[PDB]
Amino acid sequence: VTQEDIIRALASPLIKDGMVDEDFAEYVIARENRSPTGLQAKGVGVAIPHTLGDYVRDNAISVGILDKPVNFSGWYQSPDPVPVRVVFMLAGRTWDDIVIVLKWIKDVILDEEFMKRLLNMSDEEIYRQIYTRISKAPNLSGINFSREYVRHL
């Protein structure tokens, strides 16, 4: 499973729910090889593949857990790939949409005990935890997160 398998498997529930165009994963792969998003989250490996957003019909997040970590390139220079265990796929219509969730995810990946729960929870327990935290946020209205956006790989 390379980055392209991970992206297309995470974009698949988005395209079926009618929130991104048909060739959505191919756009985010194109931007992944231009401005990658490998993040050495202080404990775990985290990648946030996202895109421009004119082909995005609604803001959504698709979460993917990697039991076997996969190398992702990081934007922070350093031609040393990142061992990534959690993938946060993002689709936002406008620049104003993506900036809000990006700071929210920055607070997600700087919460070790929360983050440690993701590694050893099922697709149901993960949805219950991210939904409850998205609900408590005063922003984040307009992002969609249903039970079909959690996938282990």
Binding site: D54, N59, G92, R93, T94, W95, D96, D97, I100, N139, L140, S141, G142
Partner: peptide, 9 residues
């Protein structure tokens, strides 16, 4: 326009 984020197309 997204009323929550202010983003507009």
């Amino acid at each position: 326009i997204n009323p929550n984020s202010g983003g507009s197309s």
